[PDB]
Amino acid sequence: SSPSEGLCPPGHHISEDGRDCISCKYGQDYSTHWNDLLFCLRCTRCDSGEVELSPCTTTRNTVCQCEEGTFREEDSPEMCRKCRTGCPRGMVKVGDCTPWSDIECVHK
Amino acid sequence: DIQMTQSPSSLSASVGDRVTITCRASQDVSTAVAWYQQKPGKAPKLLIYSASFLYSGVPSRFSGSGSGTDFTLTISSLQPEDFATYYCQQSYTTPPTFGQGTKVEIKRTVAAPSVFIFPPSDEQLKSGTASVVCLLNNFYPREAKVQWKVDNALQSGNSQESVTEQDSKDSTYSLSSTLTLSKADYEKHKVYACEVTHQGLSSPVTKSFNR
Amino acid sequence: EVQLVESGGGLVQPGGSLRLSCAASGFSIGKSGIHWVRQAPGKGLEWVAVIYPHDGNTAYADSVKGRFTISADTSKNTAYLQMNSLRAEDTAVYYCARRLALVRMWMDYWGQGTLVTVSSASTKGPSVFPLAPSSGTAALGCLVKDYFPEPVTVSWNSGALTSGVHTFPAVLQSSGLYSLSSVVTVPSSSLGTQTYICNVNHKPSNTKVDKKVEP
Numbered sequence: 149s150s151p152s153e154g155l156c157p158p159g160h161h162i163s164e165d166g167r168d169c170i171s172c173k174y175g176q177d178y179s180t181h182w183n184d185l186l187f188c189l190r191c192t193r194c195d196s197g198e199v200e201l202s203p204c205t206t207t208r209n210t211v212c213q214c215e216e217g218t219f220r221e222e223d224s225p226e227m228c229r230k231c232r233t234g235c236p237r238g239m240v241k242v243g244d245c246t247p248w249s250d251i252e253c254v255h256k
Numbered sequence: 257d258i259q260m261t262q263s264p265s266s267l268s269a270s271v272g273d274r275v276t277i278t279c280r281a282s283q284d285v286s287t288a289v290a291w292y293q294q295k296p297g298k299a300p301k302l303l304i305y306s307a308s309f310l311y312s313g314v315p316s317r318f319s320g321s322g323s324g325t326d327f328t329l330t331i332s333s334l335q336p337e338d339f340a341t342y343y344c345q346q347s348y349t350t351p352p353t354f355g356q357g358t359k360v361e362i363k364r365t366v367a368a369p370s371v372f373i374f375p376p377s378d379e380q381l382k383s384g385t386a387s388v389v390c391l392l393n394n395f396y397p398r399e400a401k402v403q404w405k406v407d408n409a410l411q412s413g414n415s416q417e418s419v420t421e422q423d424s425k426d427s428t429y430s431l432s433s434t435l436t437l438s439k440a441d442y443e444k445h446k447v448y449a450c451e452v453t454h455q456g457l458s459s460p461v462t463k464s465f466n467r
Numbered sequence: 468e469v470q471l472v473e474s475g476g477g478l479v480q481p482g483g484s485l486r487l488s489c490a491a492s493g494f495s496i497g498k499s500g501i502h503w504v505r506q507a508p509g510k511g512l513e514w515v516a517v518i519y520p521h522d523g524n525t526a527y528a529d530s531v532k533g534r535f536t537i538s539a540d541t542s543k544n545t546a547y548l549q550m551n552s553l554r555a556e557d558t559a560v561y562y563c564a565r566r567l568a569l570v571r572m573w574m575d576y577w578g579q580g581t582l583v584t585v586s587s588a589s590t591k592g593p594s595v596f597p598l599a600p601s602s603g604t605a606a607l608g609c610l611v612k613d614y615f616p617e618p619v620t621v622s623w624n625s626g627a628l629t630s631g632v633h634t635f636p637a638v639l640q641s642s643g644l645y646s647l648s649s650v651v652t653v654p655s656s657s658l659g660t661q662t663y664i665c666n667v668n669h670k671p672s673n674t675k676v677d678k679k680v681e682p
Contacts, residue, residue, distance in 0.1 A: 154570065162569050164498045164521045181309065184569040186499045189312035209312075225317030225333040226272075290573055292512075299562050299577035300504075300512065311575065343512055345572070351528050352572040354512045370652075372606040374598040380610075389598055391606055391650055393633070418635040418647065430633045432648045434610075436640070465602060 155182040159206030162186060172206040180207060197228060213247040221249065258283050260344050262355035268363040268397075275331040277358045279344030284324050288348040291320055291329045294357075295340045296421050303342075304329065334360075339422075364427045368456030369395035373449075373463035376442065386442035388435045390450035390463065394428040401453035402433040406445045411435060443467070469493035469576045471501075471563050476581030478590065478616045478671060479553055485583060487548040489563035496520050496539055500566030501546040502574045503537065505559035505583075508617070513559075517566065518546055530556075553585045584616040588643055591615045592674035595667050598648065600658055600682050607680045608650035609665035613642070620668040621649040628663065658682055 149169050156162045156169035162184050163170055172178050177188035191204035194212035204210040214220055214228040231245035235253035243252025259282040269275055279289065287307035292300040302311040304320040307327060317338075319330040331338055339362050344355040369392040376386035392400055398419065404411035419431040433450065449464035475487040489501055503515040516527045520539040527535060536549040546563065560582050564574030591614050598608035611619055621634040634649035649665055667676045 164519070164569075166569055183306075183309075184571065185305075185567055185573075186569055187494070187567060192313055223316075225315070225335075227335065288571060290571075299580055300574075301577070302567070302573065302575045305568070305571070305573045345512075347572040350526050350572075352514050354514070356511045370604070370606075373602055374608070374610075377596045377599065380594070380596045380612075383594065387596070387610055387612065387646075389608075389610060389648055391608070391648075393606065393650075393652060416638045416640065416646075418638050420633050420635055430635075430650070432635050432650070434638075434646065434648065463602065 155184050157182060161188045174206050175204055178204055178206055178209050180209070216247070217245075219245060219247060219249050257349055257351065258285065258346055258353050260346055260353055260355040262342075262344055262358050264358060265356070266359040266361060268361050269334050270363050271334055271336060273334045273363075275334055275338075275360060277329040277342050277344075277360075279322075279327045279329075279355050281325050281327070281346055281348075283348075285346040285348035287323050288346055289320075289322065289327045290345040290347065292343040292345065293340045294343065300343065361422055362427045364396050366456045367394060367396045367426075367428055369393055369400065369430075369452060369454060369461075371450065371452050371461050371463045373465060375448065375465055375467070381439050381442070384439050386437045386439050388437070388448050388450075390433045390435075390452075392431045392433075392452055392454075394423070394426065394430060395454055395456060396428050397455065398429050399455065400429075400431060402431070403451045403453075404433070404435045405447070405449040405451060406437075407447050408449075469565065471565060471576050471578040473561060473563050473578045473581040476561065476583045478584040478586065480587055481554055481585055483553050483585070485550045485553065487550065487561055487563075487581060487583070489546045489548075489578065491544045491546070491565070494565065495541075496544050496546060497541040501537075501539065502564045502566060502572065503548050503561060504564060504574065504577075505557075505561045506580075507556075507559045510559075514572065515561070516548060517572065519566065520546075550583070553583075555585050557583065558585050559583060582617065586616070588615050590672045591644060592669050592672035593619065593646075593667065593676075595665065595676045595678045597678060597680045598650065599680060600653075601655070603655035604652050605655035605658055606650060606652050607663055608648050609667065609678055609680065610646070610648050611667055611669075612646045613640070613644040614646075614669050614672065614674075615644050616671050617645060618670075619645070619647060620670075621647075622666045623649075623651055624664060625666060 160169040172188035194200045198212040201213040202211040218228045220228045239253045245251045261280045289307045291304040294300045308320045317332045321328045341357045341359045372391040374389040415435045451462045453460045470492045472490045500519040516537040518537045534552045539546045560580040562580040564577040567573040593611045593614035596610040600607040631652040637645040637647045
């Protein structure tokens with residue numbers, strides 16, 4: 149409720165007169181750091197291509213992952229692409245497809 | 257008060273490329289810097305505030321860093337939606353000031369233009385003027401030289417060019433050159449020619465008509 | 468959802484006055500504020516003013532001090548930029564944005580903007596001339612000549628013909644009047660069959676032309 153040095157804590161925004169720290173609305177908005185924003189930030193919705201991994205809280209935006217069938221790597225900024233269903237002609241599977249990676253193959 | 261100098265003015269890049277835009281304040285502005293994105297015909301959008309914090313709905317491939325004088329916007333892997341002009345802002349003092357912009361355009365293979373020439377219509381001649389228009393269609397890169405010749409006499413100071421933004425499908429440019437003459441000066445000459453020079457052409461292409 | 472809508476733009480004489488409005492929805496202007504920022508045609512962004520309606524506090528760019536006044540009506544959730552003693556160099560798209568932060572001038576939810584033109588030149592509608600095809604792909608167009616101010620709008624076949632279409636940015640001729648061409652490429656086999664009509668609109672002069680382009 150009390151700002152310190154004109155910044156409010158994570159999960160809160162500052163009031164218009166700079167004297168109150170107001171809680172973000174859980175499941176609707178968030179702030180992750182000590183800020184002087186007059187508004188909390190809008191939570192990202194995992195619409196169609198992506199399913200929700202973790203919900204939005206006041207201090208944390210929601211985290212998405214691609215649905216089963218598609219994958220994206222660890223810190224990969226790339227868009228989400230389809231997993232192969234089988235290895236090419238003359239190779240074997242040594243790893244299954246997840247949200248995290250493609251199927252892994254190897255020769256003979 | 258405080259100049260923000262962006263660099264580069266413009267860059268070309270491919271989907272996937274790592275891109276780095278730098279802004280330099282003429283003074284210490286600590287971390288009181290934002291970055292904005294603007295596409296043609298549209299209003300700016302906030303990406304980043306207080307040097308490194310992402311605004312809502314901004315993907316994680318966007319990264320801001322810096323403090324004091326030197327600031328940086330990074331795009332780790334360029335996406336089709338990321339070709340736009342980017343602007344730095346300082347808000348350390350009033351008034352807040354902007355850099356002049358970094359336009360991020362898309363790199364593709366060389367493509368030669370298709371060239372067309374268009375005489376004045378009779379409707380226009382009736383009004384006492386003549387516009388001859390030369391179209392260069394769907395070329396890359398943007399660099400193109402258009403010369404006008406009227407009976408082999410090089411024309412200077414009586415034409416104007418306009419260039420299209422990079423096409424959304426094929427990423428090419430097009431340009432028009434328009435040569436304006438009075439109907440009297442138009443009707444004193446026979447051959448009207450537009451000569452085009454561009455990397456994709458092995459030799460300059462000329463289009464012409466006889467009045 | 469938050470939305471800001473600018474209104475009040477238009478063409479005025481030097482020395483003249485214009486009042487811009489910015490209607491806010493989805494948040495209280497009284498609990499934040501509004502910024503005005505302008506972009507001259509082809510240029511970057513120049514901040515002009517801000518207002519904090521809670522305490523009436525305002526600030527202005529040096530370019531604009533003494534001539535522009537920013538105000539707000541919290542009951543109508545609207546801000547206004549009263550622009551007086553206008554100069555040619557005030558010509559720009561004016562955007563309003565919401566005051567996102569207490570101290571910093573961070574701006575989000577910018578509106579589409581409103582064009583303000585300051586000139587002693589009169590409104591002038593364009594003449595539209597055919598760029599006729601056939602000097603296989605064929606090129607044809609419309610030359611939209613000698614108008615003021617911006618903008619002009621161009622479509623083909625009432626918006627049904629969008630593929631192959633290029634309507635170029637306007638260029639200011641040395642006369643002070645704009646011109647532009649809109650062009651399209653089509654199969655040259657269609658020139659005897661499909662009719663092509665450029666639909667030109669110049670709202671500033673109430674000009675509406677539909678011109679058939681024939682070989």
